[PDB]
Amino acid sequence: KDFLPLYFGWFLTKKSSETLRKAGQVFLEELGNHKAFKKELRHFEKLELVSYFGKRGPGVLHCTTKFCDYGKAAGAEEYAQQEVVKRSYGKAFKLSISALFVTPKTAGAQVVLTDQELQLWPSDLSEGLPPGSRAHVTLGCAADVQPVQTGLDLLDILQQVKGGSQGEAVGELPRGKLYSLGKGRWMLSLTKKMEVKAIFTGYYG
Numbered sequence: 001k002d003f004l005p006l007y008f009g010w011f012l013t014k015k016s017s018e019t020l021r022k023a024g025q026v027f028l029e030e031l032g033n034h035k036a037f038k039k040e041l042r043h044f045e046k047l048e049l050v051s052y053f054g055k056r057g058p059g060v061l062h063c064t065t066k067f068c069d070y071g072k073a074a075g076a077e078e079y080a081q082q083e084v085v086k087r088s089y090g091k092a093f094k095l096s097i098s099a100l101f102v103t104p105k106t107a108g109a110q111v112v113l114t115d116q117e118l119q120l121w122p123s124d125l126s127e128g129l130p131p132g133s134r135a136h137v138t139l140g141c142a143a144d145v146q147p148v149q150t151g152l153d154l155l156d157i158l159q160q161v162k163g164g165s166q167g168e169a170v171g172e173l174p175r176g177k178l179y180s181l182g183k184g185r186w187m188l189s190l191t192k193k194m195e196v197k198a199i200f201t202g203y204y205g
Protein backbone atom coordinates (compact mmCIF):
# COMPACT_ATOMS: atom_id res chain seq x y z
CA LYS A 1 0.00 0.00 0.00
CA ASP A 2 1.10 3.57 -0.74
CA PHE A 3 1.61 5.49 2.48
CA LEU A 4 -0.04 8.87 2.83
CA PRO A 5 1.46 12.32 3.40
CA LEU A 6 2.32 13.88 6.73
CA TYR A 7 -0.87 15.89 6.27
CA PHE A 8 -3.33 17.05 3.62
CA GLY A 9 -4.10 20.74 3.26
CA TRP A 10 -4.42 23.73 0.96
CA PHE A 11 -1.03 25.30 0.26
CA LEU A 12 -0.93 28.99 -0.60
CA THR A 13 0.87 30.33 -3.64
CA LYS A 14 4.01 32.44 -3.33
CA LYS A 15 1.98 35.63 -3.70
CA SER A 16 -0.82 34.56 -1.38
CA SER A 17 1.57 33.23 1.24
CA GLU A 18 3.59 36.46 1.11
CA THR A 19 0.42 38.56 1.32
CA LEU A 20 -0.87 36.86 4.44
CA ARG A 21 2.58 36.58 6.03
CA LYS A 22 2.98 40.35 5.78
CA ALA A 23 -0.65 40.88 6.82
CA GLY A 24 0.07 38.91 9.98
CA GLN A 25 3.34 40.72 10.63
CA VAL A 26 1.56 44.08 10.51
CA PHE A 27 -1.18 42.78 12.79
CA LEU A 28 1.33 41.58 15.40
CA GLU A 29 3.33 44.82 15.14
CA GLU A 30 0.19 46.93 15.51
CA LEU A 31 -1.30 44.83 18.31
CA GLY A 32 2.01 45.09 20.17
CA ASN A 33 1.81 48.88 19.90
CA HIS A 34 -1.84 49.23 20.90
CA LYS A 35 -2.45 50.58 24.39
CA ALA A 36 -5.22 48.07 25.12
CA PHE A 37 -2.68 45.23 24.79
CA LYS A 38 -0.04 46.70 27.08
CA LYS A 39 -2.49 46.95 30.00
CA GLU A 40 -3.46 43.30 29.74
CA LEU A 41 0.19 42.26 29.39
CA ARG A 42 0.23 40.60 32.83
CA HIS A 43 -2.73 38.43 31.74
CA PHE A 44 -0.62 37.58 28.68
CA GLU A 45 9.30 47.85 28.25
CA LYS A 46 7.53 46.70 25.08
CA LEU A 47 6.90 43.12 23.93
CA GLU A 48 7.22 42.71 20.17
CA LEU A 49 5.10 39.75 19.13
CA VAL A 50 7.00 38.95 15.94
CA SER A 51 9.84 37.76 18.20
CA TYR A 52 7.42 36.19 20.68
CA PHE A 53 5.90 33.99 17.97
CA GLY A 54 9.34 32.95 16.75
CA LYS A 55 8.36 29.46 15.63
CA ARG A 56 6.83 29.68 12.15
CA GLY A 57 6.76 27.20 9.27
CA PRO A 58 9.25 26.48 6.47
CA GLY A 59 7.80 29.53 4.69
CA VAL A 60 4.84 28.38 2.61
CA LEU A 61 1.70 29.04 4.59
CA HIS A 62 -0.97 26.32 4.57
CA CYS A 63 -4.39 25.38 5.90
CA THR A 64 -4.30 21.82 7.14
CA THR A 65 -7.27 19.53 6.55
CA LYS A 66 -6.24 16.09 7.81
CA PHE A 67 -3.09 15.14 9.66
CA CYS A 68 -2.24 11.61 8.51
CA ASP A 69 1.25 11.12 9.93
CA TYR A 70 1.99 9.05 6.83
CA GLY A 71 -0.89 6.78 7.87
CA LYS A 72 -0.18 6.45 11.59
CA ALA A 73 -3.00 8.83 12.51
CA ALA A 74 -6.54 7.56 13.01
CA GLY A 75 -8.87 7.86 10.01
CA ALA A 76 -5.90 8.64 7.78
CA GLU A 77 -6.38 5.81 5.28
CA GLU A 78 -10.12 6.37 5.54
CA TYR A 79 -9.69 10.04 4.65
CA ALA A 80 -7.26 9.73 1.73
CA GLN A 81 -9.37 7.06 0.04
CA GLN A 82 -12.21 9.57 -0.38
CA GLU A 83 -13.08 10.46 -3.96
CA VAL A 84 -13.37 14.18 -3.30
CA VAL A 85 -9.88 14.07 -1.76
CA LYS A 86 -8.28 12.40 -4.76
CA ARG A 87 -10.40 14.47 -7.14
CA SER A 88 -9.42 17.76 -5.52
CA TYR A 89 -5.78 16.73 -5.26
CA GLY A 90 -3.59 19.23 -7.09
CA LYS A 91 -6.53 21.54 -7.77
CA ALA A 92 -6.57 25.24 -6.85
CA PHE A 93 -8.92 26.71 -4.27
CA LYS A 94 -9.78 30.14 -2.91
CA LEU A 95 -9.73 30.36 0.90
CA SER A 96 -11.35 33.22 2.83
CA ILE A 97 -9.81 34.74 5.98
CA SER A 98 -12.43 36.25 8.32
CA ALA A 99 -10.04 37.20 11.10
CA LEU A 100 -6.55 37.10 12.55
CA PHE A 101 -6.03 36.03 16.16
CA VAL A 102 -3.44 35.80 18.93
CA THR A 103 -3.14 33.87 22.19
CA PRO A 104 -0.29 33.35 24.62
CA LYS A 105 0.58 30.20 22.65
CA THR A 106 -0.22 30.82 18.98
CA ALA A 107 -1.04 33.34 16.29
CA GLY A 108 -2.98 32.56 13.13
CA ALA A 109 -5.66 33.45 10.59
CA GLN A 110 -9.21 32.08 10.81
CA VAL A 111 -10.29 30.41 7.57
CA VAL A 112 -13.94 30.23 6.50
CA LEU A 113 -14.51 27.21 4.28
CA THR A 114 -16.98 27.08 1.42
CA ASP A 115 -19.21 24.02 1.20
CA GLN A 116 -17.14 22.42 -1.56
CA GLU A 117 -14.06 23.10 0.59
CA LEU A 118 -16.01 21.51 3.45
CA GLN A 119 -16.15 18.22 1.52
CA LEU A 120 -12.38 18.03 1.99
CA TRP A 121 -12.65 18.66 5.73
CA PRO A 122 -12.36 15.57 7.95
CA SER A 123 -14.95 14.35 10.44
CA ASP A 124 -13.10 11.69 12.43
CA LEU A 125 -14.15 9.85 15.59
CA SER A 126 -15.38 20.73 19.77
CA GLU A 127 -19.05 20.84 20.80
CA GLY A 128 -21.90 22.65 19.02
CA LEU A 129 -19.50 24.23 16.54
CA PRO A 130 -20.05 23.86 12.79
CA PRO A 131 -17.42 21.60 11.18
CA GLY A 132 -14.52 23.55 9.68
CA SER A 133 -14.49 26.12 12.48
CA ARG A 134 -11.02 24.81 13.30
CA ALA A 135 -9.83 25.77 9.80
CA HIS A 136 -6.88 28.11 10.18
CA VAL A 137 -3.47 29.21 8.96
CA THR A 138 -0.76 29.23 11.59
CA LEU A 139 1.29 32.44 11.53
CA GLY A 140 3.56 31.64 14.44
CA CYS A 141 4.04 29.68 17.66
CA ALA A 142 5.66 30.35 21.03
CA ALA A 143 8.89 28.43 21.74
CA ASP A 144 7.49 25.51 23.81
CA VAL A 145 4.21 25.26 21.88
CA GLN A 146 3.31 22.39 19.55
CA PRO A 147 1.89 23.00 16.05
CA VAL A 148 -1.40 21.35 17.04
CA GLN A 149 -2.16 24.13 19.53
CA THR A 150 -3.11 26.77 16.97
CA GLY A 151 -6.23 24.91 15.87
CA LEU A 152 -7.33 24.34 19.46
CA ASP A 153 -6.76 28.01 20.31
CA LEU A 154 -9.13 29.11 17.51
CA LEU A 155 -11.88 26.70 18.58
CA ASP A 156 -11.65 27.99 22.13
CA ILE A 157 -11.90 31.56 20.86
CA LEU A 158 -15.00 30.87 18.76
CA GLN A 159 -16.51 29.06 21.75
CA GLN A 160 -16.52 32.44 23.51
CA VAL A 161 -17.51 34.61 20.54
CA LYS A 162 -20.75 32.64 20.07
CA GLY A 163 -21.46 33.37 23.72
CA GLY A 164 -20.77 37.07 23.25
CA SER A 165 -17.78 37.26 25.60
CA GLN A 166 -15.82 39.43 23.15
CA GLY A 167 -18.16 42.28 24.00
CA GLU A 168 -17.07 45.75 22.93
CA ALA A 169 -14.13 46.06 20.52
CA VAL A 170 -11.23 47.61 22.43
CA GLY A 171 -9.74 49.09 19.26
CA GLU A 172 -10.25 49.74 15.54
CA LEU A 173 -7.46 48.77 13.12
CA PRO A 174 -7.39 50.05 9.52
CA ARG A 175 -8.32 46.53 8.35
CA GLY A 176 -10.69 45.46 11.15
CA LYS A 177 -12.02 45.70 14.71
CA LEU A 178 -9.92 44.60 17.70
CA TYR A 179 -11.30 42.37 20.48
CA SER A 180 -10.10 41.40 23.96
CA LEU A 181 -11.26 37.97 25.04
CA GLY A 182 -9.15 37.83 28.19
CA LYS A 183 -6.60 35.22 29.23
CA GLY A 184 -4.28 36.77 26.65
CA ARG A 185 -6.64 36.19 23.71
CA TRP A 186 -7.00 38.77 20.95
CA MET A 187 -9.09 38.76 17.76
CA LEU A 188 -9.06 40.98 14.69
CA SER A 189 -12.38 40.61 12.87
CA LEU A 190 -11.42 41.70 9.37
CA THR A 191 -13.63 44.32 7.75
CA LYS A 192 -13.06 42.84 4.31
CA LYS A 193 -12.19 39.16 4.17
CA MET A 194 -8.79 38.36 2.71
CA GLU A 195 -9.02 35.91 -0.18
CA VAL A 196 -5.97 33.73 -0.94
CA LYS A 197 -5.08 31.26 -3.70
CA ALA A 198 -3.98 27.80 -2.55
CA ILE A 199 -3.42 24.30 -3.97
CA PHE A 200 -4.89 21.23 -2.31
CA THR A 201 -2.25 18.53 -2.02
CA GLY A 202 -0.27 16.31 0.32
CA TYR A 203 2.87 17.22 2.28
CA TYR A 204 5.41 14.46 2.92
CA GLY A 205 8.01 16.44 4.88
Ligand SMILES: Nc1ncnc2c1ncn2[C@@H]1O[C@H](CO)[C@@H](O)[C@H]1OP(=O)(O)O
Nearest residue numbers: 007064067136137138147148149150151
Ligand atom coordinates in the same frame (compact mmCIF):
# COMPACT_ATOMS: atom_id res chain seq x y z
N1 LIG B 1 -2.26 15.77 16.45
C1 LIG B 1 -1.48 16.57 15.54
N2 LIG B 1 -0.19 16.31 15.87
C2 LIG B 1 0.81 16.92 15.20
N3 LIG B 1 0.52 17.81 14.17
C3 LIG B 1 -0.80 18.08 13.83
C4 LIG B 1 -1.79 17.47 14.50
N4 LIG B 1 -2.98 17.90 13.96
C5 LIG B 1 -2.71 18.79 12.95
N5 LIG B 1 -1.37 18.92 12.86
C6 LIG B 1 -0.62 19.70 11.94
O1 LIG B 1 0.86 19.09 11.82
C7 LIG B 1 1.58 19.98 11.24
C8 LIG B 1 3.04 20.02 11.79
O2 LIG B 1 3.63 21.22 11.36
C9 LIG B 1 0.87 21.32 11.58
O3 LIG B 1 0.60 21.98 10.44
C10 LIG B 1 -0.44 20.95 12.30
O4 LIG B 1 -1.50 21.86 11.80
P1 LIG B 1 -1.43 23.43 12.11
O5 LIG B 1 0.00 23.99 11.90
O6 LIG B 1 -2.37 24.16 11.18
O7 LIG B 1 -1.88 23.70 13.55
Ligand SMILES: [Cl-]
Nearest residue numbers: 064065066151
Ligand atom coordinates in the same frame (compact mmCIF):
# COMPACT_ATOMS: atom_id res chain seq x y z
CL1 LIG C 1 -6.56 19.81 11.72
Ligand SMILES: [Cl-]
Nearest residue numbers: 131132133134
Ligand atom coordinates in the same frame (compact mmCIF):
# COMPACT_ATOMS: atom_id res chain seq x y z
CL1 LIG D 1 -14.03 21.28 13.57
